[PDB]
């Protein structure tokens, strides 16, 4: 590679480390269907675009029981 | 003690800090009349608004014979 170079649009997002890892664990899960995490930005940081946040958005507040993602029929 | 939470919507730009350094030179001088650069995600990336980005875009294709953000009408 030449050097690290990476710009782009959508949704930056940081609160505390631990947030950080449990992004990783669910995009390791990939539990949404979608590679929300796209560059995670300085240990804190995720960049998300700001087209699938609202996954992430149903999964921070539904994921206690479940949040609605079953297209297995629709 | 304290810790930064900054969601934000936007431009991520990451490149070596170069960038950075005349970024906050041209914050300082403020030359574009906004706050293009809205927070240093640390040392390395920054973050600049889309709706602005279209100034900086100007900034870097027009600087060369010269930026002029002054428009009293153009």
């Not at 240990?43 to 921070?60: G, K, M, P, Y």
Request: charge should be negative.
């Amino acid at each position: 590679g030449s050097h690290m170079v990476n710009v782009l649009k959508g949704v930056l997002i940081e609160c505390d480390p631990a947030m950080k890892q449990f992004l990783l664990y669910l995009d390791e899960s990939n539990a949404l269907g979608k590679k929300f995490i796209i560059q995670d930005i300085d240990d804190t940081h995720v960049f998300v675009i700001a087209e699938l946040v609202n996954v992430l958005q149903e999964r921070v507040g539904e994921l206690m029981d479940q949040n609605a993602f079953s297209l297995t029929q629709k």
